[PDB]
């Protein structure tokens, strides 16, 4: 509810200042990487999900249709995840280049100036342009000079924050799992690699199954399908298969969790 109320306000402010045609800061989300999105479109056709569109000209709705189709499926979490890995990150910009994720032409951050500096600027520009009425050429040229440096910097500081935040979460998740060595969990294959497969637990803790621990067969990675295939057994572990794992090793310093396959 609040989200929606913060969104419409943010959209309202951005549209107002777009039409005012004064130097302003937006919160943009550019169109996804065509190469990354192409691969994603391939990936989802393996599960049966067919998308209307080309990678260079995809409308957000077409992506939404997929996320609706996979809802309450085992393959939800990963297709979701791989879709995400096809998106660009959202950044601050002086230009209104729209927000792909919200499918809108105008968007900014207005509604949290205590914790975000671009919101604090939006407020100062509001005060400058609307409240004080200072729409003079010199006032505009001042802000047009400074916003690009602000937008680039603040966008950097956000990414920094996210990376650190996550880095502490992974550390404390690893700290949580130290006492769970030997315990079995049910989980889902979140990612498959040539060296092994990642399994996400129900509490979003992720750990690796190294190909060394797959002692039952020689497993060959298939990159096109996202699957490790046993040569002899013909066992196929694919992205989005549920499996039961056991905790073998956890390194807190490295933030590693190692899993072995108990059963499918």
């Amino acid at each position: 509810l609040i989200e929606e109320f913060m969104l419409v306000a943010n959209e309202t402010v951005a549209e107002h200042f777009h039409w005012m045609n004064v130097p302003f800061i937006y919160r943009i989300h550019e169109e996804p990487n065509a190469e990354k999105l192409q691969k994603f479109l391939e990936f989802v056709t393996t599960f049966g999900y067919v998308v209307k569109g080309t990678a260079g000209n995809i409308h957000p709705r077409a992506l939404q249709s997929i996320l609706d189709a996979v809802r309450d499926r085992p393959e939800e979490t990963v297709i979701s995840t791989v879709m995400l890995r096809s998106m660009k990150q959202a950044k601050y910009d002086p230009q209104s280049l729209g927000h792909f994720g919200l499918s809108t032409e105008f968007y900014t951050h207005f509604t949290s100036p205590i914790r975000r500096y671009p919101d604090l600027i939006v407020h100062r520009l509001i005060r400058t342009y609307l409240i004080n009425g200072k729409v003079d050429e010199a006032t505009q040229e001042k802000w047009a000079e400074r916003l690009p440096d602000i937008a680039e910097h603040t966008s950097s500081m956000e990414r920094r924050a996210v990376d650190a935040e996550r880095e502490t979460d992974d550390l404390k998740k690893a700290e949580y799992m130290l006492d769970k060595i030997g315990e079995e969990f049910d989980g889902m294959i979140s990612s498959v690699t040539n060296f092994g497969m990642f399994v996400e637990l129900p509490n979003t803790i992720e750990g690796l199954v190294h190909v060394s621990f797959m002692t039952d067969d020689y497993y060959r990675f298939d990159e096109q399908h996202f699957a490790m295939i046993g040569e002899r057994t013909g066992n196929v572990f694919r992205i989005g298969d549920e499996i039961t794992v056991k905790v073998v090793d956890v390194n807190k310093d490295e933030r590693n969790i190692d899993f072995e396959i108990v059963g499918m």
Binding site: E42, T45, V50, K52, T54, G56
Partner: peptide
């Protein structure tokens, strides 16, 4: 996979 995308990319909409 690639060939199909190339039919969408050439312009022609793929029904099924």
């Amino acid at each position: 996979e690639a060939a199909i995308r190339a039919l969408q990319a050439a312009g022609l909409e793929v029904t099924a």
